[PDB]
Design a binder for this molecule. Sequence first.
Ligand code: ZN
Length: 258
Amino acid sequence: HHWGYGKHNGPEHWHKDFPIAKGERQSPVDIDTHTAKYDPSLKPLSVSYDQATSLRILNLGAAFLVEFDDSQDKAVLKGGPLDGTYRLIQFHFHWGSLDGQGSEHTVDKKKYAAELHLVHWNTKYGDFGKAVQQPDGLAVLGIFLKVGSAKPGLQKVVDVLDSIKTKGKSADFTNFDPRGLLPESLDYWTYPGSLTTPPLLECVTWIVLKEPISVSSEQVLKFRKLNFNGEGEPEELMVDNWRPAQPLKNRQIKASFK
Ligand SMILES: [Zn+2]
């Protein structure tokens, strides 16, 4: 009876196995744009993905991950609110059963159709496993998806999903350029938070881009054909794999823009 997104194992149940679910810096949160504070101390955000090396795409049950070779400084995030260098390890998405929901962060309570998370770890901690045990261990770039025009750079991801329909399946996925998933503007909000899936560790500097990317109805429809279950198990569509907004508590959200 492990955690998931269903009626009896979903987000309101997670605290029983993971008490930090009710902690002081949990994610996601609602971003109240009018209460967010423009911060002049914020240095420019640096996304250097030119030598990114994707390896594989995997259905882990709760989402699919595109994983990268993070054994060298090849795809890094720096600047913004960050001190030091954070290395890209994987990206994944959260999405809804309907276009009206799916994102984890919300903006003035608005839910987007999906949310992309590019996960990076602080190189001063040597690897991801050690990084998640640190309060500044990860930097996650969050990007909202709305339904409209297709995102051409997403299409290679959507076309391989038929090969990883069920939990446990993986496929080779080399030479994918995550620059094709970024919006024009790097304007962002930032705040200290957590992983949004168990173990919910409070190790994340969140950087959430203001500008969503547009993806087509057909593209998100393909996300919804995935399965939470493994092959040969009862079919349950991988939809609504999002945690809702958590209390902001003693935190301020900062904006990079005015
Ligand atoms: Zn995520």
